[model samples]
Target: HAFQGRKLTDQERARVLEFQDSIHYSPRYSDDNYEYRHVMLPKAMLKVIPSDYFNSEVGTLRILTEDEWRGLGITQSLGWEHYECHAPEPHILLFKRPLNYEAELRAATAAAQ
Candidate 1:
């Protein structure tokens, strides 16, 4: 039906049905057309989170506007950047610092030499 809204795919439907027990999803409220899920692990749901990863120093984590990313000329560069996936809020962004593959490869080759 071209005029009607599309339904979830088989995989999506399976995930939706299995959502309640899923650790990643902390859905507070769900509706016919939407679900409000928070990416958090409250005290009752967990004893502790991995503090090391959250407090990593050798990484760059920042949120920038779409225009900002475009200005950096990495919006289309493969492996240069990526955006947050399934972020519930508008304007929320996540970007990972690109790894130094060239340096890594050089180190590996020197080790072999």
Candidate 2:
């Protein structure tokens, strides 16, 4: 995923692009398979969203890969919940819950305690 509005500085941009290329791999896309992509929105659309929808930078694009989604327990629908954060035109933001979701929440909680 790419961060949109907050334009990356030259050094940051180089680093980001480098990492992107390093992790790049062919992904499957078919009627039965789907994945995530970066969502870019114009600044003007911000007025449509509620004041508290997102806690992070607004109008900036956020890209979530399938692995990130799964790791966050978002794709499998395990130990996490997706709440509609915003529906600002061409895209929508679904906030994943259990905010600091460790890989195995139950185990992590037990170990921590």
Candidate 3:
């Protein structure tokens, strides 16, 4: 990631660099095995994503290791049915349901009573 997108403040620039150094250990997140973008944003970016976005609705957010992500590809596809969220804060984000969104919501709707 480039260092001057939003133009960091004095301390922010150092912080961002430090954060970058802290994350370089696991290279899997940077691996562009999939076509979609792989972005790593701090919590600030979440507010930019509307509160009503799909993940904010019925999406189930789960953390998975790189090995787990490889395994998930065996049972479930990635970047489509469920997209990875945030960067690899050490694990991939399973940020959506696996072909059960409607069914789960229906269950929740009926179970609401």
Candidate 4:
């Protein structure tokens, strides 16, 4: 196994396995009834897909790239700021402007206080 890959300590191997386990999908969590069947949904399966998240490739609410995200005015500091476990609905709304203005305002106010 020496040539298989770089050597890993027991703890490191355990940690890596644990991390992988956390992301490994579960049929129960991703219920069959709710599976997204679109072809595009698989290419880059986002942790969560937001309806409002802009996808520049398609020129609409598709996906947010680094450039598109910055263009939308998300600051550099917030670029990597991700809050996982957020439902897709809230993530998309963060940039939807008028449609999401009310919710965005509430989030901003709450964050401020």
Candidate 5:
């Protein structure tokens, strides 16, 4: 199917299958405000999400856009976002500020030496 289009169909076969979601962080983010990383499992049927590591804290929690909308409705949401995940690649981010405890932990480690 060389001419296979991703924009095909309205319904039927679309709803014939089902989907589920899974998410994980590649590494706990650092308060250093550098690289933030994570991985999300594709919502394929039958298979369960593989185990991955995460932390309750940190920064640089920004979406990796293989996408557009110029970081809108994601990193800087206005709550009126009418956006959709139009890209094929898996690139999104999630976080919790109250979950941040990296600063307290890192301070002790630096002071220890």
Candidate 6:
């Protein structure tokens, strides 16, 4: 998704666009029927979501789903999820957990001992 607010610097803009192009072809992280998995948002217009959706102090994001994904109309193609850390800012953000990614997350939490 694009980071909304002020305009990005030339370097930042370039980096952002570059990432967009790269993800356009990357394989979908899931077997879900959607053809494309790379979700794109313009950094200049991407909104900074509320803190409730993410961890307050550490800034971890809660995973989103297909319904949430479709809510954004900017997507010309399917804006599906990929299991990755997609932090566009320093604040807490909402992210997409890979399909069936819960087991790994649970394992990580359990192995924290």
Q: Which candidate's TM-score is highest?
A: 6
Cα RMSD, each candidate = 17.0, 16.4, 13.8, 17.2, 15.6, 13.8
For each candidate, the alpha-carbon lDDT, in order, equals 0.39, 0.38, 0.40, 0.39, 0.32, 0.46
lDDT of 1 by residue, 55-79 (tens): 2463332343443333222223332
Per-prediction TM-score: 0.21, 0.24, 0.23, 0.19, 0.20, 0.29
lDDT score for candidate 6 against the true structure: 0.46
lDDT of 2 by residue, 2-108 (tens): 53234334554443343332232234333333242322333433333333333466543244334333322222332332333424445665677676577568777
Sort by TM-score, best first: 6, 2, 3, 1, 5, 4
Clash number for candidate 6: 6
List candidate 2 stretches off by more than 4 Å. 1-4, 32-113
Q: Which ten-residue region of model 1 has the weakest summed lDDT? A: 46-55
Whole-structure CA lDDT of model 2: 0.38
Q: Poorest 10 consecutive residues of model 6 by lDDT?
A: 67-76
Report how far residue 37 has shifted in candidate 4, in Å.
28
lDDT of 5 by residue, 14-110 (tens): 3312332233325535444333333443444213211111112532222233222111111233322222232332566555664547787787869
Give every collision pair in model 3. none
* Cα misplacement distance, residue 96 of candidate 5 (Å): 38
* Candidate 3: residue 98 lDDT (0-100): 62
Q: Once superposed on the true structure, which residue ranges of model 5 sit more than 4 Å away at CA?
A: 1-20, 31-35, 42-113
Model 4 regions lying over 4 Å from their true place:
1-60, 78-113
Compare the candidates by lDDT and give the number of the best one: 6
Candidate 3 lDDT by residue in tens digits, 1-113: 24212333455334434333222122232345554433343443333322332244555334443433232222223453236455554565547666988998999999999
- Please, what are the lDDT tens digits per residue for candidate 4 over residues 1-113? 22222333555444333333223322323343443211122223232223345344563454445443333323334324222133465447544358878898898988996
